[PDB]
mmCIF file of C-alpha atoms in Angstrom:
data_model
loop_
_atom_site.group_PDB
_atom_site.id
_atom_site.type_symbol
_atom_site.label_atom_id
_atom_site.label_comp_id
_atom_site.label_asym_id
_atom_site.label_seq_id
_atom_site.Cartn_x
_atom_site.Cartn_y
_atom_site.Cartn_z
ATOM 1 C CA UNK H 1 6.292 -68.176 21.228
ATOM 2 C CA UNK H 2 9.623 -66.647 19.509
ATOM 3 C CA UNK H 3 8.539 -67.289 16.118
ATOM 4 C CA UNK H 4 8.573 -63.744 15.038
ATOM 5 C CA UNK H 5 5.234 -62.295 15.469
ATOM 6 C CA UNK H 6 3.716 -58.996 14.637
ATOM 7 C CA UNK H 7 0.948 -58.915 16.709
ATOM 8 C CA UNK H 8 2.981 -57.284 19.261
ATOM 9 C CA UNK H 9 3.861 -53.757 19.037
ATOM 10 C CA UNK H 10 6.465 -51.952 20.315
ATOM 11 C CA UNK H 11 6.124 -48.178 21.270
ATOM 12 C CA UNK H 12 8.645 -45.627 22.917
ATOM 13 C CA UNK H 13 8.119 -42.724 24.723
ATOM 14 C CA UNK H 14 10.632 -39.844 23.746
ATOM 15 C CA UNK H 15 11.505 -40.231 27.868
ATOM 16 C CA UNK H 16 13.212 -43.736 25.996
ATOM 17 C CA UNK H 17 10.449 -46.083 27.396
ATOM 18 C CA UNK H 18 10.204 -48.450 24.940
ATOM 19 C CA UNK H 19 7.374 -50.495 26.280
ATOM 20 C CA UNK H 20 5.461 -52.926 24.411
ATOM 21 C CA UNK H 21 1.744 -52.680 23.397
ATOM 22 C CA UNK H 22 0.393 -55.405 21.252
ATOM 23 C CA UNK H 23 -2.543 -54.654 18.822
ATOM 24 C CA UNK H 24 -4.793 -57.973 18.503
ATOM 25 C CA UNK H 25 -4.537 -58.190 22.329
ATOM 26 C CA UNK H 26 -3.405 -55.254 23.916
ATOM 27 C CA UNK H 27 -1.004 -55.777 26.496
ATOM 28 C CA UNK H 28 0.617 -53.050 28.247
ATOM 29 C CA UNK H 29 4.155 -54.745 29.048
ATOM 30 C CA UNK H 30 7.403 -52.533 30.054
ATOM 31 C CA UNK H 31 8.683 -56.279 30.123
ATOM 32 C CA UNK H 32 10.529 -58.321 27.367
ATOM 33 C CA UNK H 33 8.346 -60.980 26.169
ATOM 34 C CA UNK H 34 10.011 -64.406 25.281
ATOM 35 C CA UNK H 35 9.350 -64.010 21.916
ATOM 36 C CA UNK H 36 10.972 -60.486 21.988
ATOM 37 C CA UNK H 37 13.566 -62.009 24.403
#
């Protein structure tokens, strides 16, 4: 949920990929999340 979280982690390659990794989970998402809509 959007409630501004920091469990999720956002990391770019220097290509510009930012995809996002989350750290208490670990998702490897090159999609926007609804809560980092």
């Amino acid at each position: 949920g959007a409630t501004a979280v920091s469990e999720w982690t956002e990391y770019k390659t220097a290509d510009g990929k930012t995809y996002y990794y989350n750290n208490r989970t670990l998702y490897s998402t090159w999609e926007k999340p609804q809560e980092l809509k």
